[PDB]
Design a protein around this ligand. Structure first.
Ligand code: SAH
Ligand code: SAH
Ligand code: XQ8
Ligand code: MG
Ligand code: MG
Lengths: 317, 346
């Protein structure tokens, strides 16, 4: 989780800035300030992220004439099979918030109406709720037979994947809109695609590009294999956010070492082994050799500017 | 220490039917508490917030919480402008509680938002004035620790002969009650901070009726049977006598008089009702096998930690079976204390 750690550390200045500039409940500040992390995993990364947020809100608190905030309540959300035991045992002893964990998909409601002041999600929202049905349909123009993911090179495949990403993100936004009070902030970080690029020439995309042929090395089951993820462009996020209506997009930007074949192969395996198993020795031996001969490509042909930062603000009334 | 986690045959989840009976018997008192004592006048919340202290791994906690939610919702719909829009239910236990198992057991089809909170209920767990109803079912007999005096070989309170406070040794009882008074008062102070004015605190715990001692309650007598099994294991050279002498559980079973004394001294709550429930298993014959597994699911951890088990519990099972008629004829069954408290308006 060290790369994801870096995203949070890179985003800290932005989070601090976002809260300093955009968090303002006017005459209606809470005594209990409530924060939720959507897709928290098992730590430590969620603890650093929540710590940075609490620190920023504390500064905000001190900045007001009559500091309104008495305490903090932080909620850690992940899927029901997340290892919450480990998360709980890892909670920082010295912290300034009451803590709770919440099981469930973040594509549903997870919290009471107008109970949240700030919502966060770091490196989670690229995970779709499912594979789009259309890319599985042998008779669709969107049949994604040649690849494990949306490369972005195929217009109809891209249509189906984006349709799913839009549906899922819009579901998330609707849910968070109900849970956040008016003026509440929603901070989102996820891997994406910078202007002038496509998924396939980002690191995550090209990794999938190397895997697809490895599987080809049952053909039928390879043709029907797809992953439930999407890496959006800034234009795509703006379309979804604008169509949604409940938030203003206060900021959307991309935040800023040699490729390690061995380490990457181990990390890639840990993330995707399950998906492959459900749909490994022989395969990841072939993948490790393929990453090996792709070092200079990762070093000098792949876009590394992929960490999207999104600050949204819950519209009033 | 938490109960046996997971969902196997030795687990708390699989062996806590007696405790579920306590919640079952409590249901009618919960309905009366809501009907009679839950009243926020013209400041009812839109989000009704409930916390369960000592929830374990389910399914009992989900049962207790569903009964409360339904009662409150019935009340809600009986108001001309039903004020409550949603429910938020918090599940609290120690940090080593098997929350993974708890969460896999939580109903995915339900009418309340849910969260779990790790930590000792002798500390603050929630923001100030955030809760409308606090629940604790068969948890508040657990002390924050064994009293220091009973571990002290030079003290008159040295509890060398028993695993718990029987009530028969005066110095041991003094040491244990002092700890209970301190602990429960600390629990009530913390809950007083967390509950809004007029909020309810609903409690059940194992206690002692008038004219009895811990010794001749089910909880006490099961410990009376454990002590000699440990002594026997020491005689047979599996553990040391020294280790037996030093073994004590952090538990106290109070009388109503004791509870009233602690409550009255605390001052943050009015005592709206204190009564002994009629347990639904009251008229059933003792079941040694099932009681053995119940008892194991609770105390296995304590024994493991102190002594560093299968053979012990085989011996224990034998003693339970042998003592069937004692449980059936000589043990007080009027032992499930129900307590309703109401946070005073500050
Ligand atoms: N629909 C969903 N609902 C809740 N959690 C989800 C989810 N889809 C994915 N996740 C979780 O999101 C996490 C992505 S990994 C990111 C962990 C952490 N936020 C960090 O920055 O390091 C995983 O723990 C995954 O289980
Ligand atoms: N200091 C403390 N803080 C929180 N939970 C505690 C505690 N001491 C004991 N407990 C918990 O209280 C529970 C007692 S068993 C009762 C479980 C449940 N309410 C039921 O009705 O079955 C255990 O889960 C134990 O771990
Ligand atoms: O939930 C618990 O912690 C327990 C739950 O139930 C307790 O035992 C029960 O204690 C009850 C109270 O005396 C009896 O009526 C029951 O027969 C008996 O099974 C366990 C016990 C035995 O020494 C002490 C406390 C423990
Ligand atoms: Mg495919
Ligand atoms: Mg002893």
């Amino acid at each position: 989780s060290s790369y994801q750690k870096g995203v949070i550390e890179a985003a800290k200045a932005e989070v601090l800035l976002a809260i300093k500039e955009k968090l303002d409940f006017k005459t209606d500040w809470p005594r209990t300030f409530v924060i939720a992390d959507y897709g928290c995993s098992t730590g430590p990364n969620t603890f650093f992220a929540m710590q940075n947020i609490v620190e920023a809100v504390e500064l905000k608190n001190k900045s007001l004439q009559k500091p309104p905030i008495v305490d903090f309540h932080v909620f850690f959300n992940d899927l029901v099979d997340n290892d919450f035991n480990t998360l709980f045992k890892s909670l920082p002893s010295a912290r300034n918030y009451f803590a709770a964990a919440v099981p469930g998909s973040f594509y549903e409601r997870l919290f009471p109406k107008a109970s949240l002041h700030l919502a966060n999600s770091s490196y989670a929202l690229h995970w779709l709720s499912k594979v789009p049905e259309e890319v599985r349909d042998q008779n669709s123009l969107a049949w994604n037979k040649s690849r494990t993911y949306c490369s972005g090179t195929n217009k109809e495949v891209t249509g189906a994947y984006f349709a799913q990403f839009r549906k899922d993100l819009n579901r998330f936004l609707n849910a968070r809109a109900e849970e956040l009070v008016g003026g509440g902030l929603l901070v989102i970080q996820l891997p994406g695609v910078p202007s002038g690029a496509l998924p396939f020439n980002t690191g995550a995309g090209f990794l999938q590009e190397l895997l697809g042929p490895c599987l080809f090395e049952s053909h039928e089951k390879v043709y029907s294999f797809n992953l439930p993820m999407y890496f959006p462009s800034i234009e795509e996020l703006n379309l979804v956010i604008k169509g949604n209506g409940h938030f203003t997009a206060e900021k959307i930007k991309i935040l800023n070492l040699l490729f390690d074949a061995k380490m990457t192969c181990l990390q890639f395996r840990s993330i995707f082994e399950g998906f492959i198993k459900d749909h490994v020795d022989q395969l990841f031996d072939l993948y490790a050799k393929k990453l090996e001969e792709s070092c200079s490509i990762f070093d000098q042909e792949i876009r590394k500017d992929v960490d999207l930062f999104v600050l949204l603000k819950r519209v009033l009334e």
